[PDB]
Amino acid sequence: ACHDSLLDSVGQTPMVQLHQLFPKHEVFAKLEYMNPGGSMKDRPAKYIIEHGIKHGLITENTHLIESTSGNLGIALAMIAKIKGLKLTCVVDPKISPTNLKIIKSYGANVEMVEEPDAHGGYLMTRIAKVQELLATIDDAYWINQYANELNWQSHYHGAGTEIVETIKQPIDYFVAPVSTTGSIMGMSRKIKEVHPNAQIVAVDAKGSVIFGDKPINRELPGIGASRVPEILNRSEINQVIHVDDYQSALGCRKLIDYEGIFAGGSTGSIIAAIEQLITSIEEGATIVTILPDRGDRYLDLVYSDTWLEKMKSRQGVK
Amino acid sequence: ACHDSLLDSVGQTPMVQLHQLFPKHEVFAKLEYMNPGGSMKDRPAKYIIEHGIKHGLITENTHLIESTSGNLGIALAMIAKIKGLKLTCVVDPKISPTNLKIIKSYGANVEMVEEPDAHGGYLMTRIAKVQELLATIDDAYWINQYANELNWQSHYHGAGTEIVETIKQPIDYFVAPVSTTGSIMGMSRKIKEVHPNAQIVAVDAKGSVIFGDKPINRELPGIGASRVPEILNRSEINQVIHVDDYQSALGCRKLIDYEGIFAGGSTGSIIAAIEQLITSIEEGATIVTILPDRGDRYLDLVYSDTWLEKMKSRQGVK
Ligand SMILES: *Cc1c(COP(=O)(O)O)cnc(C)c1O
Ligand SMILES: *Cc1c(COP(=O)(O)O)cnc(C)c1O
Ligand SMILES: [Mg+2]
Ligand SMILES: [Mg+2]
């Protein structure tokens, strides 16, 4: 059937078995990067904005606000443009030129903070700037990605629903990367309605504070956070695997070599994590995962040989 | 259903009506950029290679060759990686860093020519280098994009077939950009089996020699050629519209503003051309077109305000 807008092509993404990469397990990858905006963030962007419009929280006059320099900023910018809404993304000087240019191309405003925190980052500065904008822009809506229940709900109704409709056989392990935890919370909640014994495996960056790891400098965007998200309910997570920038990059390079799938940093994290998991679990297990974004924005990260060598040098004592 | 590889997700791309951009006509856009490799070139890459394997022209030992710095190189690199085939793309020093890096990321070899032709380009040098490689690499297969009948056939069986299956109402105009002409030839051939009165409108770059235009320096990749492709049968084309780099870029910017679709240069060409066409045709006409690739690789072209102003300055007497 024809679509009336690009919004109708959000979701119903392909599911692909990774036969070459995992010859002794049944590993299914949900290709969330094949959403029209280029990442899994199309799901919460569409869902959150449409819910707010339906319930009168967002009208054509409401200005959307979020602190994001990445995939969510791009997805919000696309949905906002389609809906006729103003959007301001709060960013910092570390935003990639590419992401900046894509967000501006969709007509979104960018508010770049300049003052680092005394310890050199921009996290507290960006949190403060969000509140400043909420204070000064009348009629605004804060996407509030780390705390908004509509984030996990979008994933419960989004890939989580499509996963249980496709993978009707028992799901032994569900493996997902984390930043807000909206994906793993929403998808695991849907999965376990049908597959109550599915083990839920969170994959996080080494140095991310989500599960209390000791903070280290992290290069990869997408995976990891510098706060504990309000969305997270730790009791729903059964196993936590941490992966470093080098490990994640090797996983990306291995996936493209073995399966011809060119995916982003957090997908490599997933691959590294699944390789670790299969040293402990039963042969032949059914494992489901999600591949959030494309390799295209990681050409100077993961896919750069010079960057990879620098990351290899970081592995501390190793 | 689950897929066994990424290849199964080639094709069946969305069709979207452009209600905002074309409020007085029924304009349907085939989103070929939503192919897994990021462009319409997934179709000929998959089709040509699979046909050669089926018919014993290509085995696991056959080395694929093509002169391409763009979308076809990326699509071939993906299909070759999946099939376990070696690929060498012949390129020149003008290749974008991004395309170079994507092709290398998929494990393809790159043969960059260095010697310009006496008149400063690399066209004759790249044609010669292809023949050199065919002479020196035993067991090779030249994709031969400008002359290979399998190129147009991929589009006849690809988007052309999906277009007639979806748009069962009379198609008044089919509008497509050209470089090899494989798309417009194959798609128009399928369309006119069902809709014999459909008018076939080619959209080309100003300065492209395909339809004998006077050569000028052209910035946009994707649309236009510096040869008359062997694939082209001119009698099958009913109308030819030429668009310049500025016009094409305005079309891209207008499409993203009106419909939230972030597409590449040749899609903007299509938009400019359809705007010209609707000054002559009947109100309410059904127009079908194709959007070959994403805006992401045009951030320093179309989507750069500084580049756009430079292009505005080129419009000669205008
Ligand atoms: C958002 C995102 C994640 C993590 O998803 P959450 O739902 O925020 O936990 C992982 N990788 C990429 C590339 C992302 O964009
Ligand atoms: C290949 C391509 C075209 C033209 O298609 P042909 O089938 O070669 O005529 C137009 N735009 C883009 C971006 C392309 O990749
Ligand atoms: Mg106001
Ligand atoms: Mg040999």
From Swiss-Prot, chains A, B:
Belongs to the cysteine synthase/cystathionine beta-synthase family. SbnA subfamily. This is N-(2-amino-2-carboxyethyl)-L-glutamate synthase. Its cofactor is pyridoxal 5'-phosphate. Keywords: Pyridoxal phosphate, Transferase. The gene is sbnA. It comes from Staphylococcus aureus (strain Newman). It is an enzyme of class 2 (transferase). The modification N6-(pyridoxal phosphate)lysine is found at K41. Homodimer. It catalyses: O-phospho-L-serine + L-glutamate = N-[(2S)-2-amino-2-carboxyethyl]-L-glutamate + phosphate + H(+). Pathway: Siderophore biosynthesis. GO terms for molecular function: transferase activity, transferring alkyl or aryl (other than methyl) groups.
